[PDB]
Coordinates of N, CA and C and ligand atoms in Angstrom, one line a residue:
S13 N -8.6 6.8 -4.9 CA -7.4 6.1 -4.9 C -6.8 5.9 -3.6
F14 N -6.6 4.7 -3.4 CA -6.0 4.2 -1.8 C -4.5 3.5 -2.2
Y15 N -3.5 3.6 -1.4 CA -2.4 3.1 -1.7 C -2.0 2.3 -0.5
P16 N -1.6 1.1 -0.8 CA -1.4 0.1 0.4 C 0.1 0.3 0.4
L17 N 0.5 0.3 1.8 CA 2.0 0.6 2.1 C 2.2 -0.6 3.4
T18 N 3.5 -0.9 3.7 CA 4.0 -1.4 4.7 C 5.0 -0.6 5.7
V19 N 5.1 -1.0 7.0 CA 5.6 -0.5 8.1 C 7.2 -0.7 7.7
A20 N 8.2 0.1 7.4 CA 9.5 -0.3 7.2 C 10.3 0.2 8.3
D21 N 9.8 1.1 9.2 CA 10.8 1.5 10.4 C 9.7 2.2 11.3
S22 N 10.1 2.4 12.5 CA 9.4 3.1 13.6 C 10.3 3.3 14.6
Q23 N 10.5 4.8 14.9 CA 11.7 5.1 15.8 C 11.0 6.3 16.7
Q24 N 11.2 6.2 18.1 CA 11.0 7.3 19.0 C 12.0 8.3 19.0
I25 N 11.7 9.4 18.3 CA 12.7 10.6 17.9 C 12.9 11.3 19.1
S26 N 11.9 11.4 19.8 CA 11.8 12.6 21.0 C 10.6 12.3 21.8
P27 N 10.4 12.9 23.1 CA 9.4 12.4 24.0 C 8.0 12.5 23.4
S28 N 7.8 13.4 22.5 CA 6.5 13.6 21.9 C 6.3 13.1 20.5
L29 N 7.3 12.4 20.0 CA 7.3 12.2 18.5 C 7.8 10.8 18.1
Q30 N 6.9 10.1 17.5 CA 7.3 8.8 16.8 C 7.3 8.8 15.4
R31 N 8.5 8.6 14.8 CA 8.5 8.6 13.2 C 8.3 7.3 12.7
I32 N 7.4 7.2 11.8 CA 7.1 5.9 11.0 C 7.6 6.1 9.8
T33 N 8.1 5.0 9.0 CA 8.2 4.9 7.8 C 7.7 4.0 7.0
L34 N 6.8 4.3 6.0 CA 6.0 3.6 5.2 C 6.5 3.3 4.0
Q35 N 6.4 2.0 3.4 CA 7.0 1.8 2.0 C 6.0 1.0 1.1
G36 N 6.2 1.2 -0.2 CA 5.7 0.4 -1.1 C 5.6 0.9 -2.6
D37 N 5.7 0.2 -3.5 CA 5.7 0.3 -5.0 C 4.2 1.3 -5.3
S38 N 3.3 0.9 -4.4 CA 2.0 1.8 -4.7 C 2.2 3.3 -4.7
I39 N 3.3 3.8 -4.0 CA 3.6 5.4 -4.0 C 4.8 5.7 -4.9
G40 N 5.3 4.8 -5.7 CA 6.5 5.1 -6.7 C 6.2 6.2 -7.4
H41 N 5.1 6.6 -7.9 CA 4.6 7.9 -8.5 C 4.8 9.1 -7.7
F42 N 5.1 9.0 -6.4 CA 5.3 10.2 -5.6 C 6.8 11.0 -6.1
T43 N 6.8 12.3 -6.0 CA 8.2 12.8 -6.1 C 8.4 13.6 -4.7
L44 N 9.7 14.2 -4.6 CA 9.9 15.2 -3.6 C 8.9 16.5 -3.4
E45 N 8.3 16.8 -4.5 CA 7.3 17.9 -4.5 C 6.2 17.3 -3.6
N46 N 5.8 16.1 -3.4 CA 4.7 15.6 -2.3 C 5.2 16.0 -0.9
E47 N 6.3 16.2 -0.5 CA 6.8 16.6 0.7 C 5.9 17.7 1.3
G48 N 5.3 17.7 2.5 CA 4.4 18.7 2.8 C 3.0 18.5 2.6
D49 N 2.7 17.7 1.6 CA 1.4 17.4 1.4 C 0.8 16.6 2.5
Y50 N -0.6 16.5 2.6 CA -1.5 15.7 3.5 C -1.8 14.5 2.9
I51 N -1.9 13.4 3.7 CA -2.4 12.1 3.3 C -3.6 11.7 4.3
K52 N -4.2 10.8 4.1 CA -5.1 10.3 5.0 C -4.8 8.8 5.4
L53 N -4.5 8.6 6.5 CA -4.5 7.2 6.9 C -5.8 6.6 7.2
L54 N -6.0 5.3 6.8 CA -7.4 4.6 6.6 C -7.7 3.6 7.7
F55 N -8.6 3.7 8.3 CA -8.8 2.6 9.4 C -10.4 2.2 9.2
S56 N -10.4 1.0 9.7 CA -12.0 0.6 9.7 C -12.4 0.9 11.1
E57 N -13.7 0.9 11.3 CA -14.3 1.4 12.5 C -13.9 0.5 13.8
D58 N -13.3 -0.5 13.7 CA -12.8 -1.3 14.8 C -11.3 -0.9 15.1
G59 N -10.8 -0.1 14.3 CA -9.4 0.5 14.8 C -8.4 0.0 14.0
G60 N -8.6 -1.5 13.3 CA -7.5 -1.8 12.4 C -7.4 -1.1 11.2
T61 N -6.4 -1.7 10.2 CA -6.2 -1.1 9.2 C -6.5 -2.1 7.9
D62 N -7.2 -3.2 8.3 CA -7.4 -4.2 7.3 C -8.9 -3.7 6.8
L63 N -9.0 -3.1 5.6 CA -10.3 -2.6 5.1 C -11.1 -3.4 4.2
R71 N -18.3 1.6 6.8 CA -17.6 3.1 7.3 C -16.1 2.9 7.5
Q72 N -15.7 4.1 7.0 CA -14.1 4.2 7.1 C -13.8 5.4 7.9
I73 N -12.7 5.2 8.8 CA -12.4 6.2 9.7 C -11.2 6.7 9.0
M74 N -11.0 8.1 8.9 CA -9.4 8.4 8.3 C -8.9 9.6 9.1
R75 N -7.7 9.8 9.0 CA -6.8 10.4 9.9 C -5.9 11.3 9.1
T76 N -5.8 12.6 9.1 CA -4.9 13.3 8.4 C -3.5 13.6 8.8
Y77 N -2.5 13.2 8.0 CA -1.2 13.4 8.5 C -0.2 14.1 7.4
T78 N 0.8 14.6 7.6 CA 1.7 15.4 6.8 C 2.7 14.2 6.3
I79 N 3.1 14.2 4.8 CA 4.4 13.7 4.3 C 5.6 14.4 4.8
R80 N 6.3 13.9 6.0 CA 7.5 14.7 6.2 C 8.6 14.5 5.2
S81 N 8.8 13.3 4.6 CA 9.7 13.1 3.6 C 9.5 12.1 2.8
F82 N 9.9 12.1 1.5 CA 9.6 11.1 0.5 C 11.1 10.5 -0.1
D83 N 11.4 9.2 0.0 CA 12.7 8.7 -0.5 C 12.3 8.3 -1.6
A84 N 12.9 9.0 -2.9 CA 12.6 8.6 -4.3 C 13.5 7.3 -4.7
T85 N 14.5 6.8 -3.7 CA 15.3 5.5 -4.3 C 14.3 4.2 -4.0
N86 N 13.7 4.3 -2.8 CA 13.0 3.1 -2.5 C 11.6 3.3 -1.8
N87 N 11.1 4.3 -2.3 CA 9.7 4.5 -2.3 C 9.1 4.5 -0.9
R88 N 9.6 5.4 -0.1 CA 9.2 5.5 1.4 C 8.8 6.8 1.7
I89 N 7.8 6.9 2.6 CA 7.6 8.4 3.4 C 7.8 8.2 4.8
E90 N 8.2 9.1 5.4 CA 8.2 9.3 6.8 C 7.0 10.2 7.2
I91 N 6.3 9.7 8.3 CA 5.4 10.4 8.9 C 5.7 10.7 10.4
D92 N 5.5 11.8 10.9 CA 5.7 12.2 12.3 C 4.4 12.2 13.2
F93 N 4.3 11.3 14.0 CA 3.1 11.3 14.8 C 3.3 11.7 16.2
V94 N 2.6 12.9 16.6 CA 2.7 13.3 17.9 C 1.9 12.2 18.7
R95 N 2.9 11.9 19.9 CA 2.6 10.9 20.8 C 1.8 11.5 21.9
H96 N 0.4 11.7 21.5 CA -0.6 12.2 22.4 C -1.3 11.4 23.3
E97 N -1.9 11.8 24.3 CA -2.9 10.8 25.2 C -3.4 11.6 26.5
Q102 N -10.9 10.0 25.0 CA -11.3 9.0 24.0 C -9.9 8.5 23.3
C103 N -9.7 7.5 23.0 CA -8.5 7.0 22.5 C -8.5 7.2 20.9
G104 N -7.3 8.0 20.5 CA -7.2 8.1 19.0 C -6.9 7.0 18.2
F105 N -7.3 6.9 17.0 CA -7.1 5.8 16.1 C -5.7 5.7 15.8
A106 N -5.3 7.0 15.3 CA -3.9 7.0 14.6 C -2.8 6.8 15.6
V107 N -2.9 7.5 16.5 CA -1.9 7.3 17.6 C -1.9 6.0 18.1
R108 N -3.0 5.5 18.5 CA -3.1 4.2 19.1 C -2.1 3.1 18.0
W109 N -2.9 3.1 16.9 CA -2.0 2.5 15.7 C -0.7 2.7 15.5
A110 N -0.2 3.9 15.7 CA 1.3 4.2 15.6 C 2.2 3.7 16.7
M111 N 1.5 3.7 17.8 CA 2.5 3.3 19.0 C 2.5 1.7 19.1
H112 N 1.7 1.1 18.6 CA 1.5 -0.5 18.6 C 2.0 -1.0 17.4
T113 N 2.2 -0.3 16.3 CA 2.4 -1.0 15.0 C 3.8 -1.8 15.1
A114 N 4.2 -2.7 14.3 CA 5.4 -3.4 14.3 C 5.8 -3.2 12.8
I115 N 7.1 -3.3 12.6 CA 7.7 -3.3 11.3 C 7.1 -4.6 10.7
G116 N 6.8 -4.5 9.4 CA 6.0 -5.6 8.4 C 4.3 -5.5 8.6
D117 N 3.9 -4.6 9.4 CA 2.4 -4.3 9.3 C 2.0 -3.4 8.2
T118 N 0.9 -3.5 7.8 CA 0.3 -2.8 6.6 C -0.8 -1.7 6.9
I119 N -0.8 -0.8 6.2 CA -1.6 0.5 6.2 C -2.0 1.0 4.8
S120 N -3.2 1.4 4.4 CA -3.4 2.2 3.1 C -3.6 3.6 3.6
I121 N -3.2 4.4 2.5 CA -3.4 5.7 2.5 C -4.3 6.4 1.4
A122 N -4.7 7.6 1.8 CA -5.6 8.2 0.4 C -4.7 9.7 0.3
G123 N -5.0 10.2 -0.7 CA -4.3 11.6 -1.1 C -3.2 11.2 -1.8
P124 N -2.1 12.0 -2.0 CA -1.9 13.3 -1.4 C -2.6 14.5 -2.0
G125 N -2.9 15.4 -0.9 CA -3.5 16.8 -1.3 C -2.8 17.9 -0.8
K126 N -3.0 18.9 -1.4 CA -2.2 20.3 -0.9 C -2.9 21.1 -0.2
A127 N -2.6 22.2 0.5 CA -3.2 23.3 1.1 C -2.5 24.7 0.7
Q128 N -3.4 25.8 1.0 CA -2.6 27.0 0.7 C -1.1 27.2 1.4
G129 N -0.3 27.9 0.7 CA 1.0 27.8 1.2 C 1.2 29.6 1.5
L130 N 2.6 29.5 2.1 CA 2.9 30.8 2.7 C 3.1 31.8 1.2
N131 N 2.4 32.9 1.2 CA 2.7 33.7 0.1 C 4.1 34.1 -0.1
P132 N 4.8 33.8 -1.3 CA 6.1 34.3 -1.5 C 6.2 35.7 -1.7
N133 N 5.4 36.3 -1.8 CA 5.6 38.0 -2.1 C 5.6 38.7 -1.0
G134 N 5.4 38.3 0.3 CA 5.8 38.9 1.5 C 7.3 39.5 1.4
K135 N 7.5 40.7 2.0 CA 8.7 41.1 2.2 C 9.3 40.6 3.5
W136 N 8.7 40.0 4.4 CA 9.3 39.2 5.5 C 8.1 38.1 5.9
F137 N 8.5 37.2 6.6 CA 7.6 35.9 6.9 C 7.5 35.7 8.5
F138 N 6.4 35.2 8.7 CA 6.0 34.8 10.1 C 5.5 33.4 10.0
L139 N 5.9 32.5 10.4 CA 5.7 31.1 10.5 C 5.4 30.6 11.9
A140 N 4.4 29.9 12.2 CA 4.0 29.5 13.5 C 3.4 28.0 13.3
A141 N 3.9 27.0 14.3 CA 3.2 25.8 14.4 C 3.3 25.0 15.9
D142 N 2.3 24.4 16.0 CA 2.5 23.4 17.1 C 3.3 21.9 16.7
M143 N 3.3 21.1 17.5 CA 4.0 19.9 17.0 C 3.3 19.1 15.9
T144 N 1.9 19.3 15.8 CA 1.3 18.8 14.8 C 1.7 19.1 13.3
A145 N 2.3 20.4 13.3 CA 2.4 21.2 12.1 C 4.0 21.2 11.8
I146 N 5.0 20.5 12.5 CA 6.3 20.8 12.1 C 6.6 20.3 10.9
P147 N 6.3 19.1 10.3 CA 6.6 18.7 9.2 C 6.1 19.5 8.1
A148 N 4.9 20.0 8.2 CA 4.3 21.0 7.0 C 5.3 22.4 7.2
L149 N 5.5 22.8 8.4 CA 6.6 24.0 8.5 C 7.7 23.8 7.8
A150 N 8.2 22.8 8.0 CA 9.4 22.1 7.5 C 9.6 22.4 5.9
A151 N 8.3 22.0 5.4 CA 8.3 22.1 4.0 C 8.2 23.6 3.5
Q152 N 7.5 24.4 4.3 CA 7.4 25.8 3.9 C 8.8 26.5 3.9
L153 N 9.6 26.2 5.1 CA 10.9 26.7 5.1 C 11.7 26.5 4.0
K154 N 11.6 25.2 3.5 CA 12.6 24.7 2.5 C 12.1 25.4 1.2
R155 N 10.8 25.8 0.9 CA 10.5 26.6 -0.3 C 10.7 28.1 -0.3
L156 N 11.2 28.5 0.9 CA 11.5 30.0 0.9 C 12.9 30.1 0.2
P157 N 13.0 31.5 -0.4 CA 14.4 31.9 -0.9 C 15.3 31.9 0.2
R158 N 16.6 31.6 -0.1 CA 17.7 31.7 0.9 C 17.8 33.0 1.7
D159 N 17.3 34.2 1.1 CA 17.4 35.5 1.7 C 16.4 36.0 2.3
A160 N 15.2 35.0 2.5 CA 14.1 35.2 3.4 C 14.4 35.7 4.9
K161 N 13.5 36.6 5.4 CA 13.8 37.2 6.6 C 12.4 37.2 7.5
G162 N 12.6 37.0 8.6 CA 11.4 36.8 9.6 C 11.5 35.8 10.9
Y163 N 10.5 35.0 11.3 CA 10.3 34.3 12.3 C 9.8 32.9 12.0
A164 N 10.2 32.0 12.6 CA 9.5 30.6 12.7 C 9.4 30.6 14.0
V165 N 8.1 30.3 14.9 CA 8.0 30.1 16.1 C 7.2 28.8 16.4
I166 N 7.8 27.7 17.1 CA 7.3 26.3 17.3 C 7.0 25.9 18.8
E167 N 5.9 25.6 19.0 CA 5.6 25.0 20.4 C 5.9 23.5 20.3
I168 N 6.3 23.3 21.4 CA 6.8 21.7 21.8 C 6.4 21.4 23.0
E169 N 6.1 20.4 23.6 CA 5.6 19.7 24.9 C 6.9 19.5 25.7
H170 N 8.1 19.2 25.2 CA 9.3 18.8 25.9 C 10.4 19.6 25.2
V171 N 11.5 20.0 25.9 CA 12.6 20.6 25.4 C 13.5 19.6 24.5
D172 N 13.2 18.2 24.8 CA 14.1 17.2 24.0 C 13.3 17.2 22.7
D173 N 12.1 17.9 22.3 CA 11.2 17.7 21.1 C 11.8 18.7 19.8
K174 N 12.9 19.6 20.4 CA 13.6 20.4 19.3 C 14.2 19.6 18.3
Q175 N 14.0 20.2 17.1 CA 14.6 19.6 15.9 C 15.5 20.5 15.3
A176 N 16.5 19.9 14.4 CA 17.4 20.7 13.5 C 16.5 20.8 12.2
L177 N 16.2 22.1 12.0 CA 15.4 22.4 10.8 C 16.1 23.2 9.9
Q178 N 16.1 22.9 8.6 CA 16.7 23.8 7.6 C 15.9 25.0 7.3
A179 N 16.7 26.2 7.3 CA 15.8 27.4 7.1 C 16.8 28.6 6.5
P180 N 16.2 29.3 5.9 CA 17.0 30.6 5.6 C 17.6 31.1 6.6
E181 N 18.9 31.8 6.5 CA 19.7 32.1 7.7 C 19.0 33.1 8.4
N182 N 18.3 34.3 7.9 CA 17.7 35.3 8.6 C 16.1 34.9 9.1
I183 N 15.7 33.6 8.8 CA 14.3 33.3 9.5 C 14.8 32.9 11.0
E184 N 14.5 33.6 11.8 CA 14.9 33.3 13.4 C 13.9 32.1 14.0
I185 N 14.4 31.3 14.0 CA 13.6 30.0 14.8 C 13.6 30.1 16.1
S186 N 12.5 30.0 16.9 CA 12.3 29.9 18.2 C 11.4 28.8 18.7
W187 N 11.9 27.9 19.8 CA 11.3 26.9 20.2 C 10.6 27.3 21.5
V188 N 9.4 27.0 21.8 CA 8.8 27.2 22.9 C 8.0 26.2 23.4
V189 N 8.5 26.0 24.8 CA 8.1 24.7 25.6 C 6.8 25.0 26.4
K190 N 5.7 24.3 25.7 CA 4.4 24.8 26.5 C 4.4 24.3 28.2
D191 N 3.8 25.4 28.8 CA 3.4 25.2 30.2 C 2.4 26.1 30.7
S192 N 2.1 26.2 31.9 CA 1.1 26.9 32.5 C 1.0 28.5 32.1
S193 N 2.3 29.0 31.7 CA 2.6 30.4 31.5 C 3.1 30.7 30.0
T194 N 3.5 29.6 29.3 CA 4.1 29.7 27.9 C 3.4 28.8 26.9
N195 N 3.0 29.5 25.9 CA 2.5 28.8 24.8 C 2.7 29.5 23.6
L196 N 2.1 29.0 22.4 CA 2.4 29.4 21.1 C 1.7 30.8 20.9
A197 N 0.4 31.0 21.3 CA -0.2 32.3 21.0 C 0.5 33.5 21.8
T198 N 1.0 33.2 23.0 CA 1.7 34.3 23.7 C 3.0 34.6 23.2
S199 N 3.7 33.5 22.7 CA 5.0 33.7 22.0 C 5.1 34.3 20.7
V200 N 3.9 33.9 19.9 CA 3.9 34.7 18.6 C 3.6 36.1 18.7
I201 N 2.6 36.4 19.8 CA 2.2 37.9 19.9 C 3.5 38.8 20.6
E202 N 4.5 37.9 21.3 CA 5.4 38.6 21.7 C 6.7 39.1 20.8
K203 N 6.7 38.4 19.7 CA 7.7 39.0 18.7 C 7.5 40.3 18.1
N204 N 8.7 40.9 18.2 CA 8.8 42.2 17.6 C 8.0 42.3 16.1
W205 N 7.0 43.1 15.8 CA 6.4 43.3 14.7 C 7.2 44.0 13.8
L206 N 7.5 43.2 12.5 CA 8.5 43.8 11.5 C 7.9 44.8 10.4
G207 N 6.5 45.1 10.7 CA 6.0 46.0 9.6 C 5.2 45.5 8.8
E208 N 4.7 46.3 7.8 CA 3.7 45.9 6.7 C 4.3 44.9 5.7
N209 N 3.7 44.4 4.9 CA 3.9 43.5 4.0 C 4.5 42.1 4.3
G210 N 4.2 41.6 5.6 CA 4.5 40.4 6.0 C 3.5 39.4 5.5
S211 N 4.0 38.1 5.5 CA 3.4 36.9 4.9 C 3.1 35.9 6.0
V212 N 2.3 35.5 6.3 CA 2.0 34.4 7.5 C 1.6 33.2 7.1
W213 N 2.0 32.1 7.8 CA 1.8 30.9 7.7 C 1.7 30.2 9.2
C214 N 0.4 29.5 9.5 CA 0.3 29.2 10.9 C -0.7 27.9 10.8
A215 N -0.3 26.9 11.7 CA -0.9 25.7 11.6 C -0.8 25.2 13.1
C216 N -1.7 25.0 13.6 CA -1.8 24.8 15.3 C -3.2 24.3 15.9
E217 N -3.3 24.3 17.1 CA -4.6 23.7 17.8 C -5.6 24.9 17.6
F218 N -7.0 24.5 17.4 CA -8.0 25.3 17.0 C -7.9 26.7 17.9
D219 N -8.0 26.7 19.2 CA -8.2 28.0 19.9 C -6.9 28.7 19.7
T220 N -5.7 28.4 19.4 CA -4.5 29.2 19.3 C -4.8 29.6 17.8
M221 N -5.4 29.0 16.8 CA -5.6 29.3 15.5 C -6.7 30.7 15.5
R222 N -7.6 30.5 16.5 CA -8.5 31.8 16.5 C -8.1 32.8 17.2
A223 N -7.2 32.7 18.0 CA -6.7 33.8 18.6 C -5.6 34.6 17.6
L224 N -4.8 33.7 17.0 CA -3.8 34.2 16.2 C -4.5 34.7 14.9
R225 N -5.4 34.3 14.6 CA -6.4 34.8 13.2 C -6.6 36.1 13.6
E226 N -7.2 36.4 14.6 CA -7.7 37.8 15.1 C -6.6 38.8 15.3
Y227 N -5.2 38.2 15.8 CA -4.2 39.1 15.7 C -3.5 39.4 14.3
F228 N -3.4 38.4 13.5 CA -2.9 38.8 12.3 C -3.7 39.6 11.4
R229 N -5.0 39.2 11.1 CA -5.9 39.6 10.2 C -6.5 40.9 10.8
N230 N -6.7 41.2 12.0 CA -7.4 42.3 12.4 C -6.4 43.4 13.1
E231 N -5.7 42.8 14.2 CA -4.9 43.6 14.8 C -3.7 44.4 14.0
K232 N -3.1 43.4 13.3 CA -2.2 43.7 12.4 C -2.3 43.9 11.0
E233 N -3.7 43.6 10.5 CA -4.2 44.1 9.2 C -3.5 43.3 8.0
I234 N -3.2 41.9 8.3 CA -2.7 41.1 7.1 C -4.0 40.8 6.4
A235 N -3.8 41.0 5.0 CA -4.8 40.7 4.0 C -4.9 39.2 4.0
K236 N -6.1 38.8 3.5 CA -6.4 37.5 3.3 C -5.4 36.6 2.6
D237 N -4.9 37.2 1.5 CA -4.1 36.3 0.4 C -2.5 36.5 1.1
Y238 N -2.4 37.0 2.2 CA -0.9 37.2 2.7 C -1.1 36.2 4.1
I239 N -2.0 35.6 4.4 CA -2.2 34.6 5.4 C -2.8 33.2 5.4
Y240 N -2.1 32.2 5.5 CA -2.7 31.0 5.5 C -2.7 30.6 7.1
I241 N -3.8 30.4 7.7 CA -3.8 30.1 9.3 C -5.1 28.9 9.2
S242 N -4.7 27.9 9.7 CA -5.5 26.7 9.7 C -5.3 26.1 11.3
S243 N -6.4 25.3 11.6 CA -6.4 24.4 12.7 C -6.0 23.0 12.2
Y244 N -5.2 22.4 12.9 CA -5.0 21.1 12.7 C -5.5 20.0 13.5
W245 N -6.1 20.3 14.7 CA -6.8 19.7 15.6 C -7.5 20.5 16.7
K246 N -8.4 19.8 17.5 CA -9.1 20.7 18.5 C -8.9 19.9 19.7
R247 N -8.4 20.3 20.9 CA -8.4 19.7 22.1 C -9.4 19.1 22.5
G248 N -9.7 17.6 22.8 CA -10.9 17.1 23.3 C -11.8 16.7 22.3
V249 N -11.6 16.9 21.1 CA -12.4 16.4 20.0 C -11.7 15.6 18.9
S250 N -12.1 14.5 18.4 CA -11.5 13.9 17.4 C -11.5 14.4 16.1
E251 N -10.6 14.1 15.1 CA -10.8 14.4 13.8 C -12.2 14.5 13.1
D252 N -12.8 13.6 13.5 CA -14.3 13.5 12.8 C -15.2 14.5 13.3
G253 N -14.9 15.1 14.5 CA -15.6 16.3 15.0 C -14.9 17.5 14.6
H254 N -13.6 17.6 14.4 CA -12.8 18.7 14.2 C -13.4 19.1 12.7
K255 N -13.4 18.2 11.8 CA -13.8 18.5 10.6 C -15.3 19.4 10.4
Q256 N -16.0 18.8 11.4 CA -17.4 19.7 11.6 C -17.2 21.1 12.1
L257 N -16.3 21.2 13.3 CA -16.0 22.4 13.8 C -15.4 23.5 12.8
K258 N -14.6 22.8 11.9 CA -14.0 23.7 10.9 C -15.2 24.2 10.1
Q259 N -16.3 23.8 9.8 CA -17.3 24.1 9.0 C -18.1 25.3 9.8
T260 N -18.4 25.0 11.1 CA -19.0 25.8 12.0 C -18.2 27.2 12.1
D261 N -16.9 26.9 12.2 CA -16.1 28.2 12.3 C -16.0 29.0 11.0
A262 N -16.2 28.2 9.8 CA -16.1 29.1 8.6 C -17.4 29.9 8.3
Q263 N -18.5 29.4 8.9 CA -19.8 30.1 8.9 C -19.8 31.6 9.6
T264 N -18.8 31.7 10.5 CA -18.5 33.1 10.9 C -17.2 33.3 10.3
Ligands
FAD301 C1 -3.4 19.1 7.1 C2 -3.0 18.4 8.4 C3 -1.9 17.8 8.6 C4 -1.6 17.0 9.8 N1 -0.3 16.6 9.9 C5 -0.2 16.0 11.1 C6 1.1 15.3 11.2 O1 2.1 15.2 10.3 N2 1.3 14.8 12.4 C7 0.7 14.8 13.4 O2 0.9 14.3 14.5 N3 -0.6 15.4 13.4 C8 -1.1 15.8 12.3 N4 -2.2 16.6 12.0 C9 -3.2 16.4 13.1 C10 -3.9 15.3 13.1 O3 -4.9 15.1 12.2 C11 -4.7 15.1 14.4 O4 -3.8 15.1 15.6 C12 -5.8 13.9 14.6 O5 -6.6 14.3 15.7 C13 -4.8 12.8 15.2 O6 -5.6 11.5 15.0 P1 -5.8 10.3 16.1 O7 -6.6 9.4 15.6 O8 -4.6 10.2 17.0 O9 -6.7 11.2 17.3 P2 -8.3 11.5 17.3 O10 -9.1 10.2 17.3 O11 -8.5 12.4 16.1 O12 -8.5 12.3 18.7 C14 -8.8 11.5 19.9 C15 -8.2 12.6 21.0 O13 -7.0 13.0 20.9 C16 -6.7 14.4 20.9 N5 -5.6 14.8 20.2 C17 -5.4 14.5 18.8 N6 -4.5 14.9 18.2 C18 -3.6 15.7 19.5 C19 -2.4 16.2 19.6 N7 -1.5 16.4 18.7 N8 -2.2 16.7 20.9 C20 -3.0 16.3 21.8 N9 -4.3 15.6 21.8 C21 -4.5 15.4 20.5 C22 -8.2 15.0 20.5 O14 -8.3 16.2 20.6 C23 -9.2 13.8 20.8 O15 -9.5 14.3 22.2 C24 -2.4 17.0 10.6 C25 -3.6 17.7 10.5 C26 -4.0 18.3 9.4 C27 -5.4 18.9 9.2

C-alpha cells in the first residue's frame, strides 16, 4: 500500500532541520498511535516522486487528526541523497507517495530507570518514546545535534534528565553517553543513531553494563558515507555477527 500526499508546509526549524508537512485523505485512517512509526518515501530512480523504486525511511513526527497531516523532520545533511535533495527543493503543492507505517522495538517499560540516546535522525522517534513513558520515569535522554540552535523543547517525564551535546572534534554522542553516571541494574535502553556510534554503544550497554537483550533497543538509522540502500545491506552484514 502506497499513500499519495501533498506538501502542505515546509519550514526551516533550525540549522540542521527542515520540517515538512504532508497532507491527504489517503492517510485519514492514521491515528496518533502512528506517531513514531516509520514510513518510506518513494522515489523513482531519477530522483523524482512521480512513480525500480528508491525508498527512504523517515519517522512520523506528528499526526494531525483534524486535517490528515503528518510532519516529517528532515536532517539537512550534505553522493547526493534522494530524500534530502527532494526536501530542500520541494514546494508547497508538490506531491509524494509513502509506504508503511511500520513499528520497531520500543523501550522496555519494565526498566527501573531509562537511558535514551539519539542523534538528529532519531529525535522524532525519541520524542515518541518519551511520550509513552510514565510521568514518574527516571533516567537520561542524551541527544547529539550539529548546532546549538538545533535544540528542541521535548516533553518528557520530569526525572528524565535531557542533555544536548553539540558534536565537534572532541564531543559526540558515544562519549557523552558513556560519561553519564551509571544508575545501576535494571536499566532499560533505547538508542538510535549513526552506525559506528551504535556499534560502540551496543558494546557498552550489552557487554560492559550487562543489559539483557530484551532491555535494550539499539539500532543504526544511517551510516556516514553510505546511502540507505547500502545501509540496509550493512545491517544484514552486522547481524551476521
Ligand atoms: C527507522 C528509521 C527512521 C528514520 N527517521 C528519520 C527521520 O525522521 N529524519 C531523518 O532525518 N532521518 C531519519 N532516518 C535516517 C534516514 O533514513 C537516513 O538519514 C537516509 O540516509 C536519508 O536519505 P537520503 O536520501 O537523504 O540520503 P541517502 O541517499 O541515503 O545517503 C546519501 C549520503 O548522505 C549521507 N547521509 C544520510 N543521512 C545523513 C545524515 N542524517 N547526516 C549526514 N549524512 C547523512 C549518507 O551517509 C550518504 O553518504 C531514519 C532511519 C530509520 C532506519
